[PDB]
Design a protein around this ligand. Structure first.
Ligand SMILES: Nc1nc2c(ncn2[C@@H]2O[C@H](COP(=O)(O)OP(=O)(O)NP(=O)(O)O)[C@@H](O)[C@H]2O)c(=O)[nH]1
Ligand SMILES: [Mg+2]
Length: 167
């Protein structure tokens, strides 16, 4: 595609940032846990009639100190938590606050992603996460990288949010 969208996937360790990205790009589910330092991907897609290029940065999970470099370069952010990891959900606000500080824009293209919805051990209610997304004024998408549930939707929705912001 010709229009380029710089997407950045952030969230706590182990929530499925890489598995989501690899499902989007390569269409398979990675069962292993290989911790990320930083990985870059490219994908040509047609969204809303426009062929475009997704430049995706798959980042290292936070330990608490997100890297300013990709918070400055990224145009939109996938903020990922796991529905069986209450702490990863509580962590989200710190990630959004760090991005908003670096951007010095009150609106920043973001999508909240609740991943691992295929698991039977949910501790984060869809309600709690929806309340957060509504307060931020951003979309909330539940995903499974394993079942591919919501994966395209999460990334494509983020591109739509970037489109409204830059234009
Ligand atoms: N059941 C299930 N397991 C998942 C899902 N997404 C990821 N996992 C599993 O969770 C583990 C961590 O996933 P991974 O994508 O590596 O996480 P990450 O957020 O990239 N971790 P890091 O920040 O260290 O790079 C792996 O064993 C992976 O298979 C999902 O939707 N469902
Ligand atoms: Mg990873």
């Amino acid at each position: 595609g010709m229009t380029e969208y710089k997407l950045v996937v952030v969230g706590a360790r182990g929530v499925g940032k890489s598995a989501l990205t690899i499902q989007l790009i390569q269409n398979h589910f990675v069962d292993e846990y290989d911790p990320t330092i930083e990985d870059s991907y490219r994908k040509q897609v047609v969204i809303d009639g426009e062929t475009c290029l997704l430049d995706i940065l798959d980042t290292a999970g936070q330990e608490e100190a997100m890297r300013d470099q990709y918070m400055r370069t990224g145009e939109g952010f996938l903020c990922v938590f796991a529905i069986n990891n209450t702490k990863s959900f509580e962590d989200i606000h710190h990630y959004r606050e760090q991005i908003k500080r670096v951007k010095d824009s009150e609106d920043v293209p973001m999508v909240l992603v609740g991943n691992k919805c295929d698991l039977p051990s949910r501790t984060v209610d869809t309600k709690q996460a929806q309340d957060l997304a509504r307060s931020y004024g951003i979309p909330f998408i539940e995903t499974s990288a394993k079942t591919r549930q919501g994966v395209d939707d999460a990334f494509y929705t983020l591109v739509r949010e970037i489109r409204k912001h830059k234009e």
